Amino acid sequence: ERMTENNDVLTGNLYPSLFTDDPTLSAIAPTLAKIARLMKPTTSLTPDDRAIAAKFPRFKDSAHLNPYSSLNIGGRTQHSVTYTRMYDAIEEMFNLI
């Protein structure tokens, strides 16, 4: 069945497959989880105190997703992990091709 291209997915109780944790996903069909895993962000959900502490409008105990990392962990400058998350991605994809 040619899956429809556009779909009213994200709003309401109908989640998209191919993006569940469910390690069975990895077991049954490799080379697919080996892709979906390369996409999940996995950074943090750091809240935002300074926003509310000035009585801005926010849902109490809100959060955000900084897409990136730091570079000054206690003043030592490790090597910008996002570079690794990018490099292994490229490497894996070209190995597959």
């Binding site: 390690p23 943090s44 750091t46 105990d61 990392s69 962990i73 992990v81």
Partner: protein, 1056 residues
């Protein structure tokens, strides 16, 4: 589930534990194709972040197959030298708290407090208490950490715990107000941690799991068996003003009694919780309830507070002061005690007869009810028709032998015309049905499989000549090795074609051999024998494989080489026996039934007499198959004994291998001496074939439409399935089934991940006894409080309440283990069969015009009152029972009185009564035996107690046929012993000690001078009718004694 934080508290000076030999884990593997690897010990906080890629640990959770073991080990070793934690050792003792460390490694140092760690990892160390005070004073932010569940290869945080900046209570309430999904324990650890969930309906399951855990904890606290820990209660608090979650949490602390088979039989349990939490608003809001009535106030409180924790009177004694200042000594629990099913094995019910109240059949406006219902498939729990016919191998070789009974042997035209008339008469269809409705050959296949697979891998020993060494020598080809103990290694090719004649021939061999000379073994060091079977390919090979030290000469005759070869004149066989052999056997049916004319009758008689002449002129001993078997033929045989050879004698014999219901017999000939009888007049076997019976071969029904009708005897077995969604049809179904079936068997399944698709099963067999006992169900003043049957039939209104039904729905319905081979055709022992034949014809010899003969039924010989099947007068007739040990009671709704006492056989007999007694006067009143003279003396005692319109019955063994057995095979259910080798015969019923059989002559003279008392004998037309009107056929370790027992006992009736 949650707060598995168990204060492991490793010590800082031992964090070099890291190099542990592959820290203990937990592997599992199921059809979900998961590769789950739980982590045991202090390592449930480690989460394989997006680092560790290309490590072995990753690349193994793509191995689709089952995971080898060594891989886990060496990969873990390869992983442990990469993983690391921060720590610093210093002077003194310190604990590590093992939590912020694992976390700031779990997330690779990206949240603010991690900066407080990576820059200076002493703050992780801490003394006796409060591993967080310094931190919180130094940072002043709430600290959030996650919990990534088991099955390491998962990374989504299913929830998150959260520590508070101010361990006091006020801060707990404060932080709980926000964070729209939250919960916290009652343990002191409350002060240090709150929970935060993800969704609305992620709370529900956690709350229910914690509730089940609190049930277990309350239980194990009740008996003061509290483990080495703390946390008085497990339940939670929350501020979600959700109708559903508040309903659950309010109804919960009133059901803290039952045990909920936590995760070992996990089930609709939570669904049942939610349902019952809903099924109270229909009670606590409306009137007309079991609220009784104060539960309203209590339940309304519990539902309206959200702040107090309600502790039953026990737990409150432990929850002291340092938690929620909101609690109460709750009490007045709701009374619902529900049972729990065992492992997958099913459940059986024992529907009762005693009660105090009744339940209604169809709504109080209408007669007959009809539950037109579905049925179960056969791919579900199957149907086995295999009738277990044998215990250990000995039961495949027993036999029985009868001797002559008269001094003359002369063929008379009377017996000849008798036999001829019987021959041209067609058989009874029911009889055909009983010895063809299968299986029995499949039964010996079972024991053969047993011994074979047992010796192969089973611990079974054969001493090279045992009966077993024959048994596995059956259906096995070239696979035997004799190292003085039979072993099977290879060449295990196994025979086919055990077409029911092999067994008869081999049993005849073993019988004739044992009778020949001593039973030292089943191997003679050299022998000879022949065979006359119509087809004997296997027997020759069987025996030639059974010896091994051959030194023999075996060959069979008369094998034209046809599969189902009929017997036709079979004559070209005798000029072939110029051998002068040893033991001879012959298996020829000799039962041509096609246009039965007298010419064929005469020639077949000449033929069988010819075979006998041949066998007796030849080798000493040897059987022959007789299939007529009227004594007329046997008379002619015993006649031809005269004028030909000698004092050689004949014997009749039945075999345990023989199919039960046949007329067949074997005739054994020996060259030995005679016991001066030489003639056959009266014998049990011949008294079987000489009956012109006609019957209906009625059979089972597997109907699935229950009806509230007393339809007496089809018979049948009920079988169907209902659902669990609503419970008002399952209850009535099980009851209206209980009015028909003494035993019920239920099995439940769950396919629909919730209460939908319930599929509960019910299956039982309709017994005559329960129908008889519930025919009355009066409990009324001659009114239709349980009656008003329509035209012709009889229909019922109220049913004896079933005790434990409502409180079994969550669990307690079994789970359909491996086979569940629930059968259709049932087996019954010969003893129970005879009891049925008497509860039969006893019920038929009741004289006409004595049916309105009220009143008193007095019954001795009770002990489950099974005689009720012998009486259909349970309409306006009360019953009193005098019998042995058993709690005496009075049953008000069925007019049945049970009284336990010896009854002494000597009391008044009021006018218009009835006295039944079976095997009652057989038994030691105190332990001493009873002579036949004492027995007839007791009969004389009873005789004088006639009561002018009151008859009585009694059963007695008669010994008429015991005096000519002379050969038994050590049965386990019907024995016989001679005293001083011939005085009187003692018989041992299935288990009990011997009893003195009453001699014949005393009963003859008694019936001679009784003048109003008769003796009733039994015949097939009484045993076939009971076997066809009641389910079950035969074959529990008996099945060849039938005839004997049918001829042993008589019944004596006393009218006046």
């Amino acid at each position: 589930m949650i707060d598995l934080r168990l204060e492991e508290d490793i010590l800082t000076a031992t964090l070099p534990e890291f190099l542990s030999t592959r820290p203990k884990y937990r592997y599992a593997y199921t059809n979900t194709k998961q590769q789950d690897i739980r982590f045991q010990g202090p390592m449930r906080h480690v989460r394989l972040t997006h680092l560790y890629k290309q490590t072995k640990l990753w690349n193994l959770q793509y191995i689709e197959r089952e995971l080898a073991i060594s891989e886990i080990d060496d990969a873990l070793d390869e992983f442990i030298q990469t993983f690391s934690l921060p720590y610093v050792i210093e002077q003194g003792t310190y604990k590590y708290n093992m939590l912020l460390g694992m976390h700031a490694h779990n997330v690779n140092y990206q949240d603010d407090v991690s900066e407080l760690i990576a820059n200076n990892p002493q703050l992780l160390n801490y003394l006796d208490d409060n591993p967080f005070s310094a931190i919180f004073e130094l940072v002043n932010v709430d600290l959030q950490i996650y919990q990534y569940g088991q099955n390491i290869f998962n990374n989504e945080a299913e929830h998150t715990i959260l520590f508070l900046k101010d361990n006091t209570n006020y801060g707990v309430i404060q932080a709980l107000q926000k964070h729209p999904f939250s919960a916290t324990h009652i343990n002191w650890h409350l002060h240090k941690h709150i929970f935060v969930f993800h969704s609305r309906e992620q709370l529900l399951n956690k709350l229910l799991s914690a509730g089940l855990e609190d049930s277990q904890l309350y239980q194990r606290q009740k008996t003061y068996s509290t483990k080495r820990g703390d946390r008085p209660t497990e339940r939670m608090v929350t501020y979600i003003e959700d109708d559903h979650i508040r309903r659950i949490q309010a109804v919960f602390p009133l059901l803290l009694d039952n045990i909920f088979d936590v995760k070992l039989h996990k089930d609709s349990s939570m669904t049942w919780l939610k349902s019952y939490a809903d099924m109270i608003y229909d009670s606590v809001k409306n009137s007309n309830s079991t609220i009784t009535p104060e539960i309203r106030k209590l339940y309304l409180r519990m539902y309206n507070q959200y702040m107090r924790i309600f502790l039953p009177i026990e737990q409150y004694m432990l929850y002291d002061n340092t938690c929620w200042p909101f609690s109460e000594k709750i009490t007045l629990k709701i009374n619902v005690r529900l049972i729990s099913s065992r492992e997958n094995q099913p459940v059986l019910w024992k529907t009762p007869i005693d009660t105090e109240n009744l339940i209604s059949i169809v709504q109080p406006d209408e007669p007959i009810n009809k539950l037109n219902f579905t049925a179960i498939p056969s791919t579900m729990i199957r149907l086995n028709d295999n009738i277990t016919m044998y215990r250990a191998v000995k039961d495949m070789f027993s036999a029985i032998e009868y001797l002559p009974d008269a001094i003359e042997n002369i063929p008379t035209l009377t017996m000849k015309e008798q036999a001829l008339s019987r021959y041209i008469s067609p058989d009874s269809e029911a009889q055909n049905f009983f010895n063809n409705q299968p299986p029995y050959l499949n039964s010996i296949m079972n024991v053969n499989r047993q011994v074979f697979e047992a010796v192969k891998r089973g611990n079974i020993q054969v001493s090279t000549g045992s009966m077993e060494h024959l048994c596995l020598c059956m259906h096995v080809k070239s696979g035997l090795i004799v190292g003085r103990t039979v072993l099977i290694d290879d060449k295990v090719v196994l025979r086919r074609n055990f077409n029911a004649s092999t067994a008869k021939m081999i049993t005849c061999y073993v019988k004739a051999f044992a009778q020949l000379y001593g039973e030292g073994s089943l191997i003679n060091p050299g022998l000879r024998m022949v065979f006359f079977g119509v087809e004997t390919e296997p027997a020759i090979d069987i025996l030639k494989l059974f010896y091994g030290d051959k030194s023999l000469y075996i060959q069979g005759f008369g094998d034209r080489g046809i599969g189902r070869d009929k017997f036709r004149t079979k004559i070209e066989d005798a000029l072939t026996l110029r051998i002068g052999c040893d033991i001879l056997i012959s298996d020829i049916d000799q039962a041509d039934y096609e246009d039965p004319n007298e010419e064929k009758f005469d020639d077949i008689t000449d033929f069988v007499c010819y075979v006998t002449e041949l066998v007796i002129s030849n080798a000493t001993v040897g059987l022959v198959k007789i299939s007529m078997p009227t004594y007329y033929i046997m008379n002619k045989i015993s006649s031809t004994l005269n004028n030909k050879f000698s004092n050689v004698a004949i014997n009749i014999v039945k075999l345990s291998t023989q199919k039960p219901y046949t007329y067949e017999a074997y005739i054994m000939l020996s060259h030995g001496s005679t016991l001066t009888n030489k003639g056959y007049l009266r014998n049990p076997v011949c008294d079987v074939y000489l009956e012109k019976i006609s019957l209906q071969p009625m059979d089972l029904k597997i109907i699935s439409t229950i009806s509230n009708e007393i339809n007496y005897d089809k018979p049948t077995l009920y079988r169907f399935v209902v659902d669990k969604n609503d419970v008002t049809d399952v209850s009535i179904a099980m009851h209206i089934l209980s009015i028909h079936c003494s035993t019920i068997t239920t099995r439940s399944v769950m396919v629909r991940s919730d209460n939908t698709g319930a599929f509960v099963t019910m299956s039982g067999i309709k017994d005559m006894k329960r129908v008889a006992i519930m025919n009355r169900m009066t409990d009324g003043t001659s009114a239709n409080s349980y009656m008003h049957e329509q035209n012709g039939k009889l229909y019922l209104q109220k049913v004896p309440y079933l005790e434990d039904l409502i409180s079994a729905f969550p669990n307690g319905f079994g789970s359909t283990y491996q086979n569940d081979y629930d059968s259709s055709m049932s087996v019954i022992n010969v003893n129970a069969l005879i009891r049925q034949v008497v509860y039969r014809v006893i019920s038929k010899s009741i004289p006409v015009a004595l049916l309105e003969s009220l009143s008193r039924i007095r019954i001795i010989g009770g002990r489950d009152l099974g005689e009720m099947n012998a009486v259909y007068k349970l309409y306006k007739t009360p019953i009193e029972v005098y019998d042995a040990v058993g709690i005496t009671r009075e049953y008000p709704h069925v007019q049945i009185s049970y009284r336990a006492q010896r009854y002494s056989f000597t009391e008044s007999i009021p006018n218009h009564t009835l006295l039944l007694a079976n095997y009652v006067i057989m038994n030691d009143v105190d332990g001493a035996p009873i002579s036949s003279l004492e027995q007839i003396n007791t009969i004389k005692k009873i005789i004088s107690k006639i009561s002018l319109g009151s008859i009585a019955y009694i059963q007695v063994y008669t010994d008429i046929v015991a005096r000519n057995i002379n050969v038994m095979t050590k049965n386990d259910s019907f024995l016989i012993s001679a005293n001083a080798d011939k005085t009187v015969f003692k018989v041992q019923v299935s288990g009990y000690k011997a009893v003195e059989m009453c001699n014949y002559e005393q009963l003859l003279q008694l019936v001679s001078d009784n003048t109003g008392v008769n003796i009733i004998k039994l015949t097939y037309q009484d045993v076939l009718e009971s076997c066809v009107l009641s389910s079950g056929i035969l074959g529990d370790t008996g099945s060849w004694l039938l005839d004997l027992v049918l001829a042993s006992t008589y019944i004596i009736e006393i009218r006046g």
